[PDB]
């Protein structure tokens, strides 16, 4: 046969991300002397909408500690964050909604978002709308902290990783039905070329390992092993179980 | 209960002098034939003295300490009263209702206030009055 559809996405010719209208990469402030030894006050100038992202964006302006200048940062807005609000980021920042603190300096049960996998990567965890990370305990020795991820997995992170207090705004978005293909068309128009999706069983044997036959059926077990090669991983990959 | 007296210091909020500090000289609580509203006669600072250090020369200190005064009638709603005071007995006579509406008399009153204000800056006192408000 020929190269199947999912193999073609790696080259990235027409499957790249549409990033003309993006407002920027939403990242925390760079970890510097002030963050790990105090706090710096910021101002929420405006809250803007980013294409392809359900979560709104917040623009916070800080003052450069080393040069007479003003620095603007793009944050993912949490619930209750309003324009003109002062934002405090650092080790000594008070426990308030919208503040960014290291994970090791907050009590257990605190709700955080935009969490860092490692200290200094400027936010990796809980970035989608309505998601948050629950802190389930600390570990004073060897500087570790245990957190609970939105998928339900428990992870152990260093106490120097930072995160913002609150829940990512824009929650409840996936509760409204799209009700037609037109709204789905505009949804993926701002993200990438992955819609509509054609069923493999409706193709020919050259196109997909499901096509062909006098009846539209798969023919073989759809559970594909983890050890399969490219061109075979179509269907359920390393499925521990199936059914409802 | 009353603070808009003949020696109070206020901050102008509107009209080409916003943010510049003035001192009330002759308040008028209940209107007048002109300006049918609460108003007062004030004298203030338009160009504040510049900072002077120990390295400045003899003539350079004199240039940087020049003060440009101004005399204006201001509405009460266009002022922000402060808690500071300044004695105005030296230049009270030159400023009056007759002083205005006469371009010749406006100029003569300003040079009296300029001399009074400058000599106050020397032998530093009322330092908050001679510092430019930052905004």
């Amino acid at each position: 046969g020929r190269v199947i559809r999912n193999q073609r996405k790696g080259a990235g010719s027409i499957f790249t991300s549409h990033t003309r209208l993006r407002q920027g990469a939403a990242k925390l402030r760079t970890l510097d002397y002030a963050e790990r030894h105090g706090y710096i006050r910021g101002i929420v100038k405006q809250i803007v909408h980013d294409s392809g992202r359900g979560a709104p964006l917040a623009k916070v302006v800080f003052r450069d500690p080393y040069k007479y200048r003003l620095r603007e940062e793009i944050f993912i807005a949490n619930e209750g964050v309003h324009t003109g609000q002062f934002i405090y980021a650092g080790k000594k920042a008070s426990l308030n909604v919208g503040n960014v603190l290291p994970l090791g300096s907050v009590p257990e049960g605190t709700i955080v978002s935009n969490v860092e996998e490692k200290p200094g990567d400027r936010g990796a965890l809980a970035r989608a709308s309505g998601n948050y990370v629950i802190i389930i305990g600390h570990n004073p020795d060897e500087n570790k902290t245990r957190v609970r991820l939105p998928s339900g997995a428990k992870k152990v992170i260093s106490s120097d990783a930072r995160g913002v207090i609150g829940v990512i705004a824009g929650g409840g978005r996936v509760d409204k039905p799209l009700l037609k293909a037109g709204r789905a068309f505009h949804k993926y128009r701002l993200k990438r070329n992955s819609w509509p999706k054609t069923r493999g069983v409706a193709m020919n044997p050259v196109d997909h390992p499901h096509g062909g036959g006098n009846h539209q059926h798969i023919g073989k077990a759809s559970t594909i092993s983890r050890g399969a090669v490219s061109g075979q991983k179509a269907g359920l990959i390393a499925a521990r179980r199936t059914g409802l | 209960a009353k603070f808009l007296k003949a020696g109070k210091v206020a901050v102008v909020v509107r009209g080409r002098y916003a943010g510049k500090k003035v001192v009330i000289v002759k308040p008028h609580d209940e209107g007048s034939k002109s300006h049918p509203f609460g108003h007062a006669l004030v004298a203030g600072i338009e160009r504040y003295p510049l900072k002077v250090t120990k390295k400045h020369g003899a003539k350079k200190v004199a240039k940087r300490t020049k003060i440009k005064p101004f005399i204006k009638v201001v509405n009460y709603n266009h002022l922000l009263p402060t808690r500071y005071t300044l004695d105005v007995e030296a230049f009270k006579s030159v400023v009056s209702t007759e002083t205005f509406e006469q371009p010749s008399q406006r100029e003569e009153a300003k040079k009296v206030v300029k001399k009074a204000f400058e000599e106050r800056h020397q032998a530093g006192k009322n330092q908050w009055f001679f510092s430019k408000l930052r905004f």
């Binding site: 040069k67 | 300490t65 330092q127």
Partner: peptide, 29 residues
Amino acid sequence: NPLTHSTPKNFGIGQAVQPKRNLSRYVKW
């Protein structure tokens, strides 16, 4: 003397901008 005043600057975190210091230890050689 009456015209000169002592106005110290605060170089703490979030205060006035830091002054020039010796950064020889952090030079990218």
